[PDB]
Design a protein around this ligand. Structure first.
Ligand SMILES: [Cl-]
Ligand SMILES: [Cu+2]
Length: 102
């Protein structure tokens, strides 16, 4: 099992602006073409799903995010580990305002 070992943003982080991407790092290889990352908004609506990786960094995945409105989000993931085992997980982060919102 390739468990999550690091993330950006990570669980319970507040970020000052919308993240350009979500970056996940696992404890073993994952297969990007058979892995999924999703961002959910604070109502649980699907904002974006996907996953990309680079062959020389088998333990990492990224997801390009659209511009995220201020508020809380959940990142969920469901990855296929290189040892053949599926891993799911999820965590929350918050986009704080960095200026007044109109
Ligand atoms: Cl590895
Ligand atoms: Cu395993």
């Amino acid at each position: 099992h390739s468990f999550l070992v690091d993330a950006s943003p990570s669980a319970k982080d507040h970020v000052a602006a919308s993240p350009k991407l979500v970056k996940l790092r696992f404890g073993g290889g994952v297969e990007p073409a058979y892995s999924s990352i999703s961002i959910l908004d604070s109502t649980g609506k699907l904002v974006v799903e996907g996953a990309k990786g680079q062959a020389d960094k088998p333990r990492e995945l990224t997801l390009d995010a659209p511009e995220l409105a201020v508020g809380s989000y959940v990142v969920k993931f469901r990855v296929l580990s290189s040892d053949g085992h599926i891993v799911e997980g999820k965590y929350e982060f918050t986009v704080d305002p960095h200026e007044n919102l109109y």
